[PDB]
Enzyme design. Structure first.
Site, short mmCIF file in Angstrom:
data_model
loop_
_atom_site.label_atom_id
_atom_site.label_comp_id
_atom_site.label_asym_id
_atom_site.label_seq_id
_atom_site.Cartn_x
_atom_site.Cartn_y
_atom_site.Cartn_z
N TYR A 1 0.81 -1.23 0.00
CA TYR A 1 0.00 0.00 0.00
C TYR A 1 0.84 1.28 0.00
CZ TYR A 1 -3.21 -3.64 1.79
OH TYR A 1 -3.92 -4.80 1.99
N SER B 1 -2.44 -6.90 8.98
CA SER B 1 -3.14 -7.33 7.77
C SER B 1 -2.15 -7.94 6.76
CB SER B 1 -3.95 -6.14 7.20
OG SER B 1 -4.99 -6.58 6.34
N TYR B 2 -2.00 -7.36 5.56
CA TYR B 2 -1.08 -7.94 4.57
C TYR B 2 0.36 -7.81 5.10
CZ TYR B 2 0.24 -9.28 -0.29
OH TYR B 2 0.69 -9.93 -1.42
N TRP C 1 -11.33 -5.89 -1.42
CA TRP C 1 -9.88 -5.78 -1.43
C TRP C 1 -9.33 -5.64 -2.84
CZ3 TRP C 1 -5.40 -8.81 -2.74
CH2 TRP C 1 -4.21 -8.30 -2.18
N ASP D 1 -12.76 -9.08 13.74
CA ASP D 1 -11.83 -9.00 12.62
C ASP D 1 -11.97 -10.23 11.74
OD1 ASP D 1 -9.47 -7.48 11.51
OD2 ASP D 1 -8.59 -9.49 11.74
N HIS E 1 -11.75 -4.98 11.21
CA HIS E 1 -10.52 -4.68 10.47
C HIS E 1 -10.31 -3.19 10.23
CE1 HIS E 1 -7.24 -6.92 8.72
NE2 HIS E 1 -7.24 -6.15 7.65
C1 LIG Z 1 -4.94 -6.39 4.87
O1 LIG Z 1 -3.96 -5.37 4.52
O2 LIG Z 1 -6.33 -6.06 4.47
C2 LIG Z 1 -6.82 -7.10 3.63
C3 LIG Z 1 -8.24 -7.42 4.10
S1 LIG Z 1 -9.08 -8.66 3.10
C4 LIG Z 1 -5.84 -8.25 3.81
C5 LIG Z 1 -5.53 -9.05 2.54
S2 LIG Z 1 -4.49 -10.50 2.90
O3 LIG Z 1 -4.63 -7.62 4.21
#
Ligand SMILES: *C1(O)O[C@H](CS)[C@@H](CS)O1
Ligand SMILES: *C1(O)O[C@H](CS)[C@@H](CS)O1
Ligand SMILES: [Cl-]
Ligand SMILES: [Cl-]
Ligand SMILES: [Cl-]
Ligand SMILES: [Cl-]
Ligand SMILES: [Cl-]
Ligand SMILES: [Cl-]
Ligand SMILES: [Cl-]
Ligand SMILES: [Cl-]
Ligand SMILES: [Cl-]
Ligand SMILES: [Cl-]
Ligand SMILES: [Cl-]
Ligand SMILES: [Cl-]
Ligand SMILES: [Cl-]
Ligand SMILES: [Cl-]
Ligand SMILES: [Cl-]
Ligand SMILES: [Cl-]
EC number: 3.1.1.84
Lengths: 574, 574
Positions: free
Chosen positions: B43, B116-117, B165, B258, B286
């Protein structure tokens, strides 16, 4: 190396009195001096993530060759001295700007940016007369601290804002003191209790007795609660009357549900004739920049557009600090988020040229009490001489729902008003269901013919968009405390039973009421804890026990001889 | 100088295939090499404010003498190569860690943190076998991408997560491409339309026909939609089975609402025996870390505690990267936000020792359809053999309300369920009003005896806290897609009319149901668009037109011979 920078922490900057303020220096890899941006912060200069998401991706500025200085205000965190809100910020900004301009790495051009207190401090800097300050960018801010955020144009105390913020700072004051104290843990618990229940905190009488907050931050009582009139203590810290004589470019941001909206917009009007002013207004409240609310979604475009804001700020600073004459090509003067259509739209001025300030008169058969009453709004004067009457009891004020709340449930500006529509002290007046859109964009006010059984009371007015499904969505509202009907400075009491024509300043909005909607106005005598509750006695309100207060029988007069109305800033775009 | 640092932008790091990834280096003023923390970000590494507020005030780490490296993942922003989710991150992390360890400024100790990612990529790094990686801190993440966030333990597609996403990344892919394109403006508008209306986007049939998203990110169909079974394509990118053989300390954060909660908790269980694992779970979704929701407020203590998180992360890294043996003194193993009481509480393990996994049986006189039906929950087996029956029509699925939604209204986890309580396909079972508190903290599952007129269908179960005022607040939920009742890998169809005993994995929660509340369970056959809708045909669901789908008459069996129940992780604390 282009795009690279260094950060120097806790550089100590001496003020005129020898007290040193702490700053952090974000300085680009460059071969000579650079333009500089200053941010003055009472919430820990180290804690950049706390405020920056409400502002700009300002590291872009540093990568692009600006230096950024972030300063702890006097008496907080790494700075020396004693903290008192507002009173030292003119002088401390002047001294800080002077120090910056003297540095080897400053090229003689300084600007500022930031939100809320980091915005107010920019107006305080701008009146310094420091020639090296070339541009400011105050977001969600005010140049008159009485008018926002502590009291307002109606002369009522913004009690939830005061108590919430004082508790917020109280956390900061304890955290940044010399040595840890035995009472700190318990104080931290009590402050959390206030922030979890701001209406509860505001409900204690006398309001002025604040054992915890008065100890941690004496100013809460000594300045704010103790000075209900817009007196010399407030005038001292006001910047507004000095704004007209400035010629400093200002990039001003506001939010339709932000506590500062009225004052933010006023600053734009005050500076636009003498320098390059810019205005951006989104549908945000102070703590909710998402565009998403419980009963109203504005779309992803409404989410605070931080990268567009960053681009606009950089263009603005490029023009005014770097002398790049074409830097603002294609940038609008004014950019508004127009609710209803829920779209951004560019304008050439604020107020909009071609605003038709149009009276909508209060009318109807039978009582206007409650949403199921007979109250109407019409561009035609009402034919019959009527009055709506209700009891305002300070023990049972109308609860605040959305609007410009700051700390008490301040994340739901466009709140559905239905929960208070069955109340007898909420007078409702609405248009018929609209067949064509009606745009209302500009400052909003009401002119009401009122009477009371009391020698003082309040009147409130709230503009509402009624949706097809019944949601009654708040737009903008105001209050008039009757003793201040003619002046915030030299109040006088009213005569029981006498009719007065009073103005209610309802701040501003931008909304298209779409086909199938109604325009609605709610009138009452309280809006708590957005505003403190009038005691209906004529006394010193904040010093009164609840039991000392009186009920008031209040009356709204409407008809040909008493043409009570709301003034709507109508925009017609064909 | 202690506390000072520099930032070097766009340092290009070569991968094994010669493709260079861009990193930014935040390096302290120090006299020798330092411990290093790595963050891998799709990102934009420049955009630190976008994610950091969901993580840590990590500049504190840099001021305290850690270097921080933030990297653009392959094919995005300043990095070379082509972006495809997940598939390159094991190798790219291995190569990046190797490069870091070679640098003059790295002392041989590397860690990771992020959300998250930026969390998933830490598990992908941890399986690299790079000895220099001493600790990770994955927040709101998964080590099994099928199980979260793309499908789930029940074998239904998490369609709103996928489409939301993909649209989010689609914005990023266009922004970071070489040269601007004529179609970009229109594509940007279409992506916004998806993000404003994720349920609408998910409603198009066949689901697999995604002209915009399939063009911008072919993976959305080629990997995700086209692979509904937990097959070899998913196994390739799964890290989970490798976690047991690691001995890497992990500081794991999760949220009760989440999307990743089930998988985050599973990672803790997988690594706790072999290394120092820590767990923190708050009541967040989230995109909503505030503790505030439309119909449920958890208190200011529930707001993501970023400075406490920063302190804990620093202590954790001090222990494992700096070998400071006493750095984690007084830090709990597990820290949970226990809802209901709405308080943080320390624990020694997850699952909690002394969890009593207690069946609550479905019962009642007459139909359990709707909240006004007769459905009961009891720790006693039901005496009479009954069944509740409903029609599940894919054209009218039960709307998702709160729970673990990611992109479609993903900011209201503890959502009031009343809007769906009058539906005939929502079966409700509740306890009597409680006179004493009942704590449910742990993993939650249901065992249902079910039958269908169809050869495939879904069953859902949702745990709910019914408040005194009638709010029916969602806690945790799950789904079973019947073809996957026994395995996610090798599905088989069911026989119409036959009774099956099936398990529904309902993830996890921590809630004290207080006196005056009820424990409630909702059972249905859809939860859209949290999960895609079963076509009730046995076909390839994502390739079916709505008209091709069938209705199903579904039945829940309950009584002594078919003791359908929810298994609640009961905690008794006297
Ligand atoms: C995070 O950065 O937000 C997304 C929510 S589905 C996820 C993708 S693995 O990672
Ligand atoms: C900003 O930082 O938040 C406060 C809301 S009352 C305000 C005080 S001037 O500044
Ligand atoms: Cl220097
Ligand atoms: Cl001082
Ligand atoms: Cl003191
Ligand atoms: Cl809406
Ligand atoms: Cl727009
Ligand atoms: Cl105009
Ligand atoms: Cl009368
Ligand atoms: Cl008169
Ligand atoms: Cl170097
Ligand atoms: Cl590649
Ligand atoms: Cl292409
Ligand atoms: Cl609540
Ligand atoms: Cl707590
Ligand atoms: Cl236990
Ligand atoms: Cl039958
Ligand atoms: Cl059977």
């Amino acid at each position: 190396v282009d795009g690279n920078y260094s950060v120097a922490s806790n550089v100590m900057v001496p003020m005129r009195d020898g007290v040193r303020l702490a700053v952090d220096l974000y300085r680009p890899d460059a071969d000579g001096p650079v333009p500089v941006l200053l941010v003055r912060n009472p919430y820990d200069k180290f804690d950049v993530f706390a405020w920056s998401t409400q502002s700009t991706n300002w590291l872009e500025f540093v990568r692009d060759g600006y230096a950024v200085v972030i300063q702890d205000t006097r008496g907080l965190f790494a700075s020396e001295g004693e903290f008192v809100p507002h009173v030292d910020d003119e002088a401390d900004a002047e001294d800080t700007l002077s120090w910056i301009l003297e540095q080897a790495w400053c090229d003689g051009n300084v600007g500022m940016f930031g939100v809320s207190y980091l915005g107010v401090t920019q107006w305080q800097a701008a009146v310094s007369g420091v020639g090296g300050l070339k541009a400011i960018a105050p977001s969600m801010a005010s140049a008159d601290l009485y008018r926002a955020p502590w009291y307002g144009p109606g002369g009522a105390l913004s009690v939830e804002a005061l108590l919430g913020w004082s508790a917020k700072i109280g956390t900061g004051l304890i955290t940044s003191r010399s040595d840890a104290r035995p009472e700190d843990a318990a104080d931290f618990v009590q402050l959390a209790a206030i922030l979890n229940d701001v209406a509860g905190a505001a409900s204690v009488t006398p309001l002025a007795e604040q054992p915890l907050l008065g100890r941690l931050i004496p100013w809460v009582i000594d300045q704010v609660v103790d000075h209900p009139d817009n007196d010399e203590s407030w005038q001292s810290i006001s910047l507004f009357e000095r704004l007209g004589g400035l010629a400093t470019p200002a990039l001003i941001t506001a939010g339709w549900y932000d506590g500062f909206v009225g004052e933010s917009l006023r600053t734009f009007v005050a500076v636009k004739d003498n320098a390059d002013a810019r205005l951006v207004v989104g549908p945000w409240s102070h703590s909710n920049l998402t565009g998403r609310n419980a009963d109203r979604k504005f779309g992803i475009a409404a989410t605070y557009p931080i990268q567009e804001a960053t681009t606009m700020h950089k263009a603005f600073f490029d023009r005014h600090l770097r002398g790049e004459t074409d830097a603002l090509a294609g940038v609008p003067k004014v950019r508004l988020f127009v609710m209803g259509i829920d779209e951004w739209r560019d304008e050439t001025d604020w107020p909009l040229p071609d605003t038709a300030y149009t009276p909508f008169y209060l009318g109807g058969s039978g009582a206007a009490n409650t949403s199921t009453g007979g109250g109407t709004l019409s561009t035609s004067i009402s034919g019959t001489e009527s009055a709506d009457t209700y009891l305002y009891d300070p023990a049972d004020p109308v609860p605040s729902l959305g609007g410009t709340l700051l700390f008490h449930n301040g994340d739901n500006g466009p709140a559905d008003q239905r929960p208070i529509h069955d109340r007898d002290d909420v007078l409702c007046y609405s248009t018929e269901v609209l067949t064509d859109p009606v745009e209302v964009t500009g400052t909003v006010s009401a002119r009401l013919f009122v009477s009371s059984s009391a020698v003082d009371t309040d009147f409130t007015a709230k503009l509402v968009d009624v949706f097809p499904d019944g949601r009654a969505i708040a737009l903008c509202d105001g209050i008039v405390r009757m003793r201040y009907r003619e002046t915030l400075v030299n109040p006088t009491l009213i005569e029981a039973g006498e009719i007065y024509e009073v103005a209610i300043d309802m701040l501003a909005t931008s909304n298209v009421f779409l086909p199938g909607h109604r325009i609605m106005v709610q009138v009452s005598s309280s809006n708590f804890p957005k505003y403190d509750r009038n005691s209906n006695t004529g006394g010193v309100i904040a010093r009164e026990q609840l039991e000392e207060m009186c009920t008031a029988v209040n009356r709204i007069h409407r008809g040909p001889e008493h043409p009570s109305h709301i003034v709507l800033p109508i925009i017609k775009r064909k």
